[PDB]
C-alpha cells in the first residue's frame, strides 16, 4: 500500500465543501464533492454500457464561450464521514512487549497469525470511532458502491 | 407445430459491400503549378500569363 | 411601485412519485441507434400435463412450444421554447434564469402526467365502485389481497392515493386502540405508516383525471372474438362490437372505461383454477384504449386492453374460466358521464420508462440540464432578424407495457 | 428518408417474470406410514387394520 | 462562426461545414470545391485516332 | 497507391504550390496483457531469478 | 436403450426420458411421476364456513 498525492483540475467549479465548515482548513466538515470530466468512451470502457450517461448539473459555463464539444460528462466523488461502533482486540502475548491493542480488521485467520506472536486476552472492548467513506455518484445513481479509506 | 418465430431476431450486420471506382490519369499528367494559389475571388475572377 | 427586490416569490409545486415507483431498469441502454424505434422482450412459457395410466405410449398428443413478446417505442417530442425581444427581456430580468427554475418542472409534470394516462388506459384490473371513495382500512387491504390471489411474486407492490384520501385513513389510525407510537404519529403528524395492509402505500397530490362517456342500454356482444393465443401473443389486445347501445351518440366509451364481462370468471393463473371474493366469484374486466362511438342500431366496436385467452388447441395458456360467445351480457362500471381522480395500484413489472439520449445540434450553442434523475437538452439560437432570440428545451420519453394483468385502478366500495 | 434498412429488429434474451402458487398441503399430510409401502409385489392397493 | 474542417483526396483539398437548423430540428452538411482552368497553347494538343 | 491524412492547418493564408506531400502518422497504443513470468532458482552464483 | 435421468424437486421425484426418431429428424423428451393416495377415516376432516 502506498500513499500518493494528486492535483485537481478546475477548483472553483469542482470542489465543494459543506456549508457549515467555516475554518481555513475546513477541519469541520461532515461531507465533500470532487466532480470531474470524462469522455463517453471511457464511459463505457468502465463503468457500464448498458445504463446511458446522466451527469451533473452546474450550469456555470456557457458564459460567453463557443461550445462544441457534447462528449463530456460529469462524475462526482463523495466523501462522507461517520460515527461507527467497532471492536478492539488486545494481543497481551508476553514476548516482544505485552500491551498491544489492535481493531477487528485484522483476523487471526485473515493474516496468518495463529496465535505465534498474540493471545486473545481481552477482545469485548467497544469503542465508537470516526471513519471515513468514499463513494462515486452522478445524477441517476451509484456508479461504485461506498468502500473506507484509511485515515480520519 | 411448433410456432416460435419470435424466439429470433432480424439482423443486419456492419459490413459494406464493395463499390465501383474510377481512374484519375488526365488531373495527375497536366500542369498545375502555374495556376497554383494564384486567383483570389476577391480581387477578381481572372489571371493572365503572357506569351513569348 | 418601480424598485422590484431581486428574489422572485415562491410558488405552487407538484411531487414526483411515479417515475420513481415504476421500473427504469429493463429498458434503459436498449432504443439505440441500431434498434431502431422500438425493442422487443421475451414472454415466460407454460406447460399442460396429460392424464394417462399406461406408460408404453411414446405415441401420442404432445404440447407445442410458442413464443411471445413485449414491445416498447418511444414517444413525442415534449418541448417548450420560448422568445424574446433582448432590450426589455435584459431590461432587470436574468435572461431566462427565472424561466430557468420553471420549465424543467413543467416538463417532468407533463412527463408524469402521460405516464399516468398511459397507465390508467393500459391497466386491465379493477376494484370496487367509481362513486364510493376511501373511507376504511378494507379499501386499501383489498388491492394487496387481490393482487396476490392472482398469483403474482416476482416484484414489489405499490398503491397511490389522492391527499385528502391519506388524511380520512390517518383519521381512522387514530382510533386504534393498542398501538402507543401509531396513535401519536397519527394524532400529531397524519402520517399513515409506509407497509399499509401488506402494500406500499404513497400519497400524490398529482393524479390524473376522467370523465366516463355517456353510456346506456343493455349491452351483448354480436360476434363471437377470437382470442387465442396466436393472435393475442404479442399485444394482449382484442377487439370486440356489442349490440344494444343507444342510437347513435359521440364518445360513446371513453379510452380508461372499465367493461365487466358477468359470466366469465378470472382464473388463478398457475392453478387454472377461479377466483373466489368471499361471498362471490371474480368476474372478468377490460380497459378500453380509445374512444369508440356508436353508428345507428347501437353497433359499437371498442378495442380492449386484456384478453380472456380460451384457446382449445393449447390449453396452457388459459387464464378465464369459459370463453365468451355470442349474446354473453356486459356492463359498464361507473355512472353515465361523472368526471373522477382514479387511485393506482400496481406490481413493479407492469410499465417501464425510458429517456432516449438526445445529440447537439451542428453550429448551435447548447447545454444539459438535470433534474430528478432526468437529462433536458436546451439550444440557444438567433433565427430573425428582429431582436428576436430563440431558446427551446427538449426531451424524448419511451414506454413499454409488459402484461396488463398486474395492474389498474382500484375505489372504495360500500 | 427511408433509412429502415439500417436498422434491425431485435428481441433481447430476457423473460419477464410469472405467476406462481403456493403448497401447504404436501408438507402437512402424513406420508411416513405410506413409504415404499408399495411394491412390485404388493401391487396396486395396499390396506391398514382399524382399531 | 459555423463548425468546418478541410479533408484530402488525390491531392486536392475539400472544404466540409456541418450546421443545422434549430426551429425544423434537423441537422446537415456539405462539402465544397472551386475548380480553375486555363488554356496555354491549342497547338500543343489534341485527339488522334488510328489511320486505315 | 498512396492515401494521406488530414490535419486541416495549412494553406490558411498562405501560398501553397507543391501537392507532393504525404501525411503519415504513427500510432502508439498502451495495454495491460497477461504474460507467464518464469522463475530459474540455480544456486549457482545466485539463485533468485525471474 | 434409452438414455434417462431423475431429478429433485420439492422433495419430489421426476423422471425424464429423452429420445429422437431417426427418419425425421426429431428430438422428443417426457417427464414421469406416479401419485399415490389414501383416506384413512372419512370422520376426521371436512369443510368449514361462516355463520351469522
Same mark, same amino acid.
Not at chain 3, 151 to 166: H, I, K, L, Q
Given at each position: 500500500? /502506498? ?49 446511458? $450517461? ?15 464539444? @457534447? ?10 464521514? /461517520? ?70 | ?52 | ?19 420513481? $415507483? ?20 421475451? /414472454? ?56 430557468? @427554475? ?80 401509531? !396513535? ?15 402494500? /406500499? ?99 359499437? $366496436? ?23 360467445? @355470442?349474446?354473453?351480457?356486459?356492463? !359498464? ?82
Amino acid at each position: 500500500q /502506498r500513499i500518493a498525492i494528486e492535483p485537481i483540475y478546475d477548483p472553483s467549479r469542482s470542489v465543494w465543501f459543506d456549508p457549515d465548515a467555516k475554518k481555513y482548513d475546513k477541519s469541520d466538515a461532515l461531507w465533500a464533492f470532487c466532480m470531474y470530466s470524462l469522455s463517453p468512451e471511457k464511459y463505457e470502457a468502465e463503468y457500464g454500457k448498458k445504463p446511458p $450517461t446522466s451527469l451533473d448539473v452546474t450550469s456555470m459555463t456557457s458564459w460567453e464561450y463557443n461550445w462544441f464539444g @457534447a462528449d463530456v460528462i460529469y462524475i462526482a466523488k463523495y466523501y462522507e464521514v /461517520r460515527k461507527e461502533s467497532v471492536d478492539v482486540i488486545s494481543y497481551r502475548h508476553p514476548i516482544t512487549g505485552e500491551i498491544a491493542t489492535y481493531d477487528s480488521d485484522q483476523v487471526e485467520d485473515i493474516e496468518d497469525e495463529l496465535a505465534i506472536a498474540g493471545f486473545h486476552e481481552v477482545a469485548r472492548r467497544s469503542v465508537k470511532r470516526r471513519r471515513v467513506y468514499v463513494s462515486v455518484v452522478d445524477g441517476d445513481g451509484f456508479l461504485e458502491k461506498p468502500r473506507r479509506i484509511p485515515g480520519e | 407445430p411448433n410456432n416460435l418465430d419470435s424466439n429470433v431476431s432480424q439482423i443486419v450486420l456492419k459490413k459494406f459491400l464493395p463499390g465501383f471506382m474510377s481512374d484519375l490519369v488526365l488531373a495527375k499528367t497536366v500542369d498545375r503549378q502555374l495556376l497554383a494559389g494564384e486567383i483570389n475571388s476577391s480581387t477578381g475572377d481572372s489571371v493572365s500569363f503572357k506569351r513569348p | 411601485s418601480q424598485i422590484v427586490l431581486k428574489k422572485f416569490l415562491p410558488g405552487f409545486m407538484s411531487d414526483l412519485v411515479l417515475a420513481k $415507483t415504476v421500473d427504469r431498469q429493463l429498458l434503459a441502454g436498449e432504443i439505440n441507434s441500431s434498434t431502431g424505434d422500438s425493442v422487443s422482450f421475451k /414472454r415466460p412459457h407454460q406447460f399442460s400435463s396429460l392424464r394417462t395410466p399406461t406408460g408404453d405410449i411414446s405415441g401420442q398428443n404432445k404440447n407445442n412450444l410458442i413464443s411471445g413478446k413485449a414491445t416498447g417505442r418511444v414517444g413525442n417530442y415534449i418541448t417548450v421554447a420560448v422568445e424574446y425581444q433582448q432590450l426589455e427581456e435584459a431590461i432587470k430580468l436574468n435572461q431566462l434564469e427565472e424561466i430557468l @427554475a420553471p420549465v424543467r418542472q413543467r416538463i417532468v409534470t407533463d412527463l408524469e402526467t402521460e405516464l399516468a394516462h398511459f397507465m390508467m388506459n393500459n391497466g386491465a384490473l379493477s376494484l370496487g365502485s367509481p362513486n364510493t371513495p376511501i373511507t376504511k382500512w378494507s379499501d386499501v387491504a383489498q388491492t394487496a389481497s387481490f393482487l396476490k390471489d392472482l398469483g403474482v411474486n416476482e416484484g414489489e407492490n405499490y398503491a397511490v392515493m389522492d391527499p385528502w384520501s391519506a388524511q380520512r385513513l390517518a383519521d381512522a389510525q387514530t382510533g386504534l386502540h393498542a398501538s402507543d407510537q401509531l !396513535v401519536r404519529t397519527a394524532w400529531e403528524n397524519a402520517q399513515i405508516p409506509t407497509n399499509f395492509g401488506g402494500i /406500499r402505500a404513497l400519497m400524490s397530490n398529482g393524479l390524473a383525471s376522467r370523465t366516463q362517456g355517456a353510456f346506456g342500454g343493455t349491452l351483448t356482444v354480436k360476434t363471437q372474438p377470437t382470442v387465442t393465443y396466436n393472435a393475442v401473443k404479442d399485444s394482449y389486445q382484442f377487439t370486440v362490437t356489442l349490440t344494444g347501445a343507444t342510437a347513435s351518440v359521440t364518445g360513446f366509451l371513453k379510452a380508461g372505461d372499465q367493461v365487466k364481462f358477468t359470466n366469465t370468471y378470472w382464473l388463478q393463473q398457475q392453478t387454472k383454477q377461479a377466483l373466489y371474493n368471499g361471498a362471490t366469484p371474480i368476474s372478468f374486466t377490460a380497459t378500453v384504449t380509445a374512444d369508440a362511438n356508436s353508428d345507428s342500431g347501437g353497433d359499437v $366496436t371498442v378495442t380492449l386492453s386484456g384478453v380472456p385467452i380460451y384457446d382449445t388447441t393449447n390449453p396452457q395458456y388459459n387464464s378465464v374460466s369459459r370463453q365468451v360467445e @355470442a349474446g354473453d351480457a356486459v356492463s !359498464v362500471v361507473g355512472t353515465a358521464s361523472q368526471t373522477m381522480k382514479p387511485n393506482l395500484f400496481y406490481n413493479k413489472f407492469f410499465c417501464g420508462l425510458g429517456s432516449i439520449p438526445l445529440p447537439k445540434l451542428h453550429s448551435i450553442d447548447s447545454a444539459v440540464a438535470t433534474y430528478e434523475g432526468f437529462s433536458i437538452r436546451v439550444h440557444k439560437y438567433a433565427d430573425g432578424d428582429a431582436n428576436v432570440q430563440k431558446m427551446r428545451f427538449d426531451l424524448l420519453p419511451a414506454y413499454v407495457c409488459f402484461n396488463p394483468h398486474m395492474g389498474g385502478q382500484f375505489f372504495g366500495n360500500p
